[PDB]
Design an enzyme around this catalytic site. Structure first.
Site, PDB file in Angstrom:
ATOM      1  N   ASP A  60      -1.599  -3.422   7.653  1.00  0.00           N
ATOM      2  CA  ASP A  60      -1.342  -4.369   6.736  1.00  0.00           C
ATOM      3  C   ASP A  60      -0.141  -3.868   5.694  1.00  0.00           C
ATOM      4  O   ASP A  60      -0.075  -2.650   5.533  1.00  0.00           O
ATOM      5  CB  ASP A  60      -2.754  -4.318   5.692  1.00  0.00           C
ATOM      6  CG  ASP A  60      -2.536  -5.032   4.462  1.00  0.00           C
ATOM      7  OD1 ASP A  60      -2.520  -4.651   3.598  1.00  0.00           O
ATOM      8  OD2 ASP A  60      -2.744  -6.579   4.856  1.00  0.00           O
TER       9      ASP A  60
ATOM     10  N   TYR B  94       5.311  -3.647  -1.349  1.00  0.00           N
ATOM     11  CA  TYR B  94       4.913  -2.048  -1.208  1.00  0.00           C
ATOM     12  C   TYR B  94       6.159  -1.438  -1.237  1.00  0.00           C
ATOM     13  O   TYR B  94       5.999  -0.152  -1.437  1.00  0.00           O
ATOM     14  CB  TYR B  94       4.066  -1.769  -0.367  1.00  0.00           C
ATOM     15  CG  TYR B  94       2.587  -2.435  -0.490  1.00  0.00           C
ATOM     16  CD1 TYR B  94       2.176  -3.230  -1.301  1.00  0.00           C
ATOM     17  CD2 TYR B  94       1.875  -2.683   0.817  1.00  0.00           C
ATOM     18  CE1 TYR B  94       1.000  -3.877  -1.559  1.00  0.00           C
ATOM     19  CE2 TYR B  94       0.601  -3.304   0.822  1.00  0.00           C
ATOM     20  CZ  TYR B  94       0.186  -3.977  -0.412  1.00  0.00           C
ATOM     21  OH  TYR B  94      -0.910  -4.594  -0.522  1.00  0.00           O
TER      22      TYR B  94
ATOM     23  N   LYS C  22       2.846 -10.211   3.323  1.00  0.00           N
ATOM     24  CA  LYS C  22       2.433 -10.793   2.285  1.00  0.00           C
ATOM     25  C   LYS C  22       3.561 -11.192   1.416  1.00  0.00           C
ATOM     26  O   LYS C  22       4.465 -10.523   1.461  1.00  0.00           O
ATOM     27  CB  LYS C  22       1.326 -10.253   1.201  1.00  0.00           C
ATOM     28  CG  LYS C  22       0.250  -9.605   1.930  1.00  0.00           C
ATOM     29  CD  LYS C  22      -0.786  -8.821   1.073  1.00  0.00           C
ATOM     30  CE  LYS C  22      -1.646  -7.794   1.715  1.00  0.00           C
ATOM     31  NZ  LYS C  22      -0.925  -6.583   1.989  1.00  0.00           N
TER      32      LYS C  22
ATOM     33  N   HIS D 296       0.393 -13.387  -1.621  1.00  0.00           N
ATOM     34  CA  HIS D 296      -0.407 -12.244  -1.984  1.00  0.00           C
ATOM     35  C   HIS D 296      -1.198 -12.413  -3.124  1.00  0.00           C
ATOM     36  O   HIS D 296      -2.163 -11.921  -3.326  1.00  0.00           O
ATOM     37  CB  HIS D 296       0.903 -11.319  -2.319  1.00  0.00           C
ATOM     38  CG  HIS D 296       0.418  -9.842  -2.322  1.00  0.00           C
ATOM     39  ND1 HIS D 296       1.373  -8.653  -1.835  1.00  0.00           N
ATOM     40  CD2 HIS D 296      -0.656  -9.062  -2.774  1.00  0.00           C
ATOM     41  CE1 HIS D 296       0.734  -7.777  -2.460  1.00  0.00           C
ATOM     42  NE2 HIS D 296      -0.450  -7.933  -2.448  1.00  0.00           N
TER      43      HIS D 296
HETATM   44  N1  LIG Z   1      -3.861  -8.003  -1.242  1.00  0.00           N
HETATM   45  C1  LIG Z   1      -3.875  -7.291  -2.104  1.00  0.00           C
HETATM   46  O1  LIG Z   1      -3.783  -7.637  -3.433  1.00  0.00           O
HETATM   47  C2  LIG Z   1      -4.221  -5.569  -1.960  1.00  0.00           C
HETATM   48  C3  LIG Z   1      -4.401  -5.064  -2.887  1.00  0.00           C
HETATM   49  C4  LIG Z   1      -4.856  -3.763  -2.917  1.00  0.00           C
HETATM   50  C5  LIG Z   1      -5.022  -3.056  -1.571  1.00  0.00           C
HETATM   51  N2  LIG Z   1      -4.502  -3.842  -0.563  1.00  0.00           N
HETATM   52  C6  LIG Z   1      -4.462  -3.346   0.976  1.00  0.00           C
HETATM   53  O2  LIG Z   1      -5.505  -2.592   1.137  1.00  0.00           O
HETATM   54  C7  LIG Z   1      -5.309  -1.166   1.451  1.00  0.00           C
HETATM   55  C8  LIG Z   1      -6.399  -0.185   1.293  1.00  0.00           C
HETATM   56  O3  LIG Z   1      -6.676  -0.277  -0.471  1.00  0.00           O
HETATM   57  P1  LIG Z   1      -6.175   1.078  -1.177  1.00  0.00           P
HETATM   58  O4  LIG Z   1      -4.728   1.362  -0.722  1.00  0.00           O
HETATM   59  O5  LIG Z   1      -6.132   0.335  -2.523  1.00  0.00           O
HETATM   60  O6  LIG Z   1      -7.227   1.969  -1.277  1.00  0.00           O
HETATM   61  P2  LIG Z   1      -8.427   2.673  -0.376  1.00  0.00           P
HETATM   62  O7  LIG Z   1      -8.078   2.194   0.924  1.00  0.00           O
HETATM   63  O8  LIG Z   1      -9.670   2.220  -0.674  1.00  0.00           O
HETATM   64  O9  LIG Z   1      -8.311   4.043  -0.594  1.00  0.00           O
HETATM   65  C9  LIG Z   1      -7.173   4.730  -0.331  1.00  0.00           C
HETATM   66  C10 LIG Z   1      -7.042   6.430  -0.741  1.00  0.00           C
HETATM   67  O10 LIG Z   1      -8.401   6.788  -0.153  1.00  0.00           O
HETATM   68  C11 LIG Z   1      -7.798   8.171   0.373  1.00  0.00           C
HETATM   69  N3  LIG Z   1      -8.518   8.340   1.697  1.00  0.00           N
HETATM   70  C12 LIG Z   1      -8.496   7.746   2.632  1.00  0.00           C
HETATM   71  N4  LIG Z   1      -9.283   8.159   3.765  1.00  0.00           N
HETATM   72  C13 LIG Z   1      -9.959   8.885   3.372  1.00  0.00           C
HETATM   73  C14 LIG Z   1     -10.930   9.662   3.525  1.00  0.00           C
HETATM   74  N5  LIG Z   1     -11.450   9.695   4.758  1.00  0.00           N
HETATM   75  N6  LIG Z   1     -11.524  10.757   2.915  1.00  0.00           N
HETATM   76  C15 LIG Z   1     -11.291  10.866   1.376  1.00  0.00           C
HETATM   77  N7  LIG Z   1     -10.268  10.213   0.952  1.00  0.00           N
HETATM   78  C16 LIG Z   1      -9.671   9.264   1.886  1.00  0.00           C
HETATM   79  C17 LIG Z   1      -6.562   8.062   0.701  1.00  0.00           C
HETATM   80  O11 LIG Z   1      -5.857   9.472   0.408  1.00  0.00           O
HETATM   81  P3  LIG Z   1      -4.551   9.666   1.508  1.00  0.00           P
HETATM   82  O12 LIG Z   1      -3.646   8.468   1.637  1.00  0.00           O
HETATM   83  O13 LIG Z   1      -3.712  10.817   0.719  1.00  0.00           O
HETATM   84  O14 LIG Z   1      -5.204  10.274   2.687  1.00  0.00           O
HETATM   85  C18 LIG Z   1      -5.776   7.219  -0.686  1.00  0.00           C
HETATM   86  O15 LIG Z   1      -6.006   8.094  -1.814  1.00  0.00           O
HETATM   87  C19 LIG Z   1      -4.008  -1.187   0.906  1.00  0.00           C
HETATM   88  O16 LIG Z   1      -3.226   0.159   0.981  1.00  0.00           O
HETATM   89  C20 LIG Z   1      -3.248  -2.386   0.927  1.00  0.00           C
HETATM   90  O17 LIG Z   1      -2.916  -2.260   2.378  1.00  0.00           O
HETATM   91  C21 LIG Z   1      -4.152  -5.186  -1.015  1.00  0.00           C
END
Ligand SMILES: NC(=O)c1ccc[n+]([C@@H]2O[C@H](COP(=O)([O-])OP(=O)(O)OC[C@H]3O[C@@H](n4cnc5c(N)ncnc54)[C@H](OP(=O)(O)O)[C@@H]3O)[C@@H](O)[C@H]2O)c1
Length: 316
Positions: free
Chosen positions: A44, A49, A78, A111
């Site tokens: 994704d 980004y 997006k 987005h």
């Molecule tokens: N459409 C939209 O508006 C929108 C908005 C927000 C997010 N997104 C997408 O959704 C994705 C995921 O959401 P997000 O980035 O907000 O957060 P997330 O996936 O909920 O959390 C990411 C965080 O969790 C940590 N983490 C990952 N695996 C872990 C594990 N096994 N144990 C402990 N911590 C862990 C990562 O650390 P490290 O990276 O340091 O390992 C990072 O700090 C995004 O990256 C993006 O691609 C889309």
């Protein structure tokens, strides 16, 4: 359970993808290379980004090395808010394609429903800080997205952060040519989204859950915020199943027939996070995790709360 879900365009989408928001440009190439090596087939992405070039370097090496074939990958990006204008959508998509080193995207999403004034700034603000809108509406932007399908640049189009009345507006669009294939929304045990999910699924729109771990690296986090990964109730369910808390948080949306896109740049966690096809949460476990809902959002787009298309005033 099955690794892909069928979309309303006839293509299959891997239910587990790698997120890339906040992945540093100097770490994301390795993160995506490791993800593809350990089984991920969905990445994704987004122009906003600011790391699509580096993601693309990883995709291109793994294609060149024949670790995977292009048909086996499902790459998502997006359209950012400052490109909702008809004359700007194709070029925004082509910039993303060029950066990702691809000739097509599997899925391209609007987005946010909110269009912003075009320009260099991703969040153009006024003399008081308010986002400057564009007079684009959701329906003309959707028509522009439909042309991308007809030109071969994207195989599927969808939406992100659309509330149900906004999804409905597209489904009721005069002359609608392609229905949205996906609505990508925030979803986790503190924001369980039962109403919006049931609406979308009832319409054959697949839901992708973002921030499934509660985005502990979100830039505006506050020590006082809830923390899914540290919630002792979720840790107990994990312990019961001899899995990590993150693995339970990734399996949870999978069992709701959602797609889920956990982000990591840590090789060990990228691999751990994919090892979620070997266990099952019980229905009791699922209902218990749903009971943790608190309507808590990571991503509330607070600079845009007066925009006419701001999605989060409506209940769902
Ligand atoms: N459409 C939209 O508006 C929108 C908005 C927000 C997010 N997104 C997408 O959704 C994705 C995921 O959401 P997000 O980035 O907000 O957060 P997330 O996936 O909920 O959390 C990411 C965080 O969790 C940590 N983490 C990952 N695996 C872990 C594990 N096994 N144990 C402990 N911590 C862990 C990562 O650390 P490290 O990276 O340091 O390992 C990072 O700090 C995004 O990256 C993006 O691609 C889309």
């Amino acid at each position: 359970m099955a690794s892909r879900i069928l979309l309303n365009n006839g293509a299959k989408m891997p239910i587990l993808g790698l997120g890339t928001w906040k992945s540093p440009p100097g770490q994301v190439t390795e993160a995506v290379k490791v993800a593809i090596d350990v089984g991920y087939r969905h990445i994704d992405c987004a122009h906003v980004y600011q790391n699509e070039n580096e993601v693309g370097v990883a995709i291109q090496e793994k294609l060149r090395e024949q670790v995977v074939k292009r048909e086996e990958l499902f790459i998502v990006s997006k359209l950012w808010c400052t490109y909702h204008e008809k004359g700007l959508v194709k070029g925004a998509c082509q910039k993303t394609l060029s950066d990702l080193k691809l000739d097509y995207l599997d899925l391209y999403l609007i987005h946010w429903p909110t269009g912003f004034k075009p320009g260099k700034e991703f969040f153009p603000l006024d003399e008081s800080g308010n986002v400057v809108p564009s007079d684009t509406n959701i329906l003309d932007t959707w028509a522009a997205m439909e042309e991308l399908v007809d030109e071969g640049l994207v195989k599927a189009i969808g939406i992100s952060n659309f509330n149900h009345l906004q999804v409905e507006m597209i489904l009721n669009k005069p002359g609608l040519k392609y229905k949205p294939a996906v609505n990508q929304i925030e979803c986790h045990p503190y924001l369980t989204q039962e109403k919006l999910i049931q609406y979308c699924q009832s319409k054959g729109i697949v839901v992708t859950a973002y921030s499934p771990l509660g985005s502990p690296d979100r830039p505006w986090a506050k020590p006082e915020d809830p923390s899914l990964l540290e919630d002792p109730r979720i840790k107990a369910i994990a312990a019961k199943h001899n899995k990590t808390t993150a693995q339970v948080l990734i399996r949870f949306p999978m069992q709701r027939n959602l797609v889920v896109i956990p982000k990591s740049v840590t090789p060990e966690r990228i691999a751990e996070n994919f090892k979620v096809f070997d266990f099952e949460l019980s229905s009791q476990d699922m209902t218990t995790l749903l009971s943790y809902n608190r309507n808590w959002r990571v991503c509330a787009l607070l600079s845009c709360t007066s925009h006419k298309d701001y999605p989060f005033h409506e209940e769902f």
